[PDB]
Amino acid sequence: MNYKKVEASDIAAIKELIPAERVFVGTEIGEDFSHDELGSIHSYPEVLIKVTSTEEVSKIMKYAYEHNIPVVVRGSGTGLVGACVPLFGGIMLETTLMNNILELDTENLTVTVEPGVLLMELSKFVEENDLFYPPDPGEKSATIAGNISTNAGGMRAVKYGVTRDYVRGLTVVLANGEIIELGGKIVKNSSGYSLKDLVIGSEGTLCVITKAILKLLPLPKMTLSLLIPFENISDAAGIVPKIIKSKAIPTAIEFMERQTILFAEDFLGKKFPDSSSNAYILLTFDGNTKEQVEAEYETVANLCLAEGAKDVYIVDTVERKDSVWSARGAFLEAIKASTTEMDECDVVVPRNRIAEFIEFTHDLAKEMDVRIPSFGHAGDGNLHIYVCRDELCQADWEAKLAEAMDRMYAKALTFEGLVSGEHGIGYAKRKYLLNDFGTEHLALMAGIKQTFDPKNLLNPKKVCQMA
Ligand X SMILES: Cc1cc2nc3c(=O)[nH]c(=O)nc-3n(C[C@H](O)[C@H](O)[C@H](O)COP(=O)(O)OP(=O)(O)OC[C@H]3O[C@@H](n4cnc5c(N)ncnc54)[C@H](O)[C@@H]3O)c2cc1C
Which one of residues 11, 17, 198, 262 is an interface residue with its own copies (CB under 8 A)? Answer: 198
Q: Which residues of 123-154 are buried (b: 16+ CB within 10 A; e: fewer)?
A: bebbeeeebbbbbbbebeebbbbbbbbbbbbb
Distance of CA 25 to the CA centre of its chain: 30
Q: Which of residues 385-444 bind its own copies (CB under 8 A)?
A: 416-425, 429, 433, 436-438, 440-442, 444
- The reply on whether position 288 binds another protein by CB under 8 A is no
- Residues 355, 286: Cα–Cα separation, whole Å: 27
**DSSP 3-state assignment of 254?**
strand
Torsion of CA 344, 382, 141, 150, to 10 degrees: 90
Q: Distances in Å between the alpha carbon of 268 and those of 261, 272, 323, 341, 375? A: 11, 10, 10, 20, 18
- The reply on whether position 422 binds ligand X by CB under 6 A is yes
- The reply on whether position 254 binds ligand X by CB under 6 A is no
- The reply on whether position 279 binds another protein by CB under 8 A is no
CB-based contact 429:465 (threshold 8 Å): no
For residues 76 and 361, which CB has a smaller minimum distance to ligand X in the complex? 76
Q: Which of residues 105-134 bind another protein (CB under 8 A)?
A: none
Pairing of β 71-74 and β 91-94 = parallel
- The reply on whether position 411 binds ligand X by CB under 6 A is no
- Interacting residue ranges for Fe ion, rule: CB under 5 A: 382, 422
Q: Which of residues 4-43 bind ligand X (CB under 6 A)?
A: 36-37
Q: Which of residues 168-227 bind ligand X (CB under 6 A)?
A: 203-204, 208-209
Q: Where are the beta strands (DSSP E) in 95-235?
A: 101-105, 110-113, 131-132, 167-173, 179-181, 208-215, 217-218, 222-230
For residues 145 and 324, which CB has a smaller minimum distance to another protein in the complex? 324
- The reply on whether position 70 binds its own copies by CB under 8 A is no
Amino acid code (one letter) for 16:
E
Which one of residues 8, 318, 393, 395 is an interface residue with another protein (CB under 8 A)? Answer: 318
Q: Distances in Å between the alpha carbon of 288 and those of 157, 221, 224, 241, 343? A: 20, 5, 11, 25, 41
Least spacing, CB of residue 294 vs another protein, in Å: 11
Least spacing, CB of residue 12 vs its own copies, in Å: 30
Q: Kindly state the greatest CA–CA separation across the chain.
A: 74
Picked from ligand X, another protein, its own copies, none, the partner binding residue 312 (CB below 5 to 8 A depending on kind) is another protein
- The reply on whether position 460 binds ligand X by CB under 6 A is no
**Positions that interact with ligand X (CB under 6 A):** 36-37, 72-80, 83-84, 95, 115, 137-139, 142-143, 145-147, 149-150, 152-154, 203-204, 208-209, 332, 422-423, 459
**Positions that interact with another protein (CB under 8 A):** 226-227, 270-274, 290, 298, 301-302, 305, 311-320, 323-324
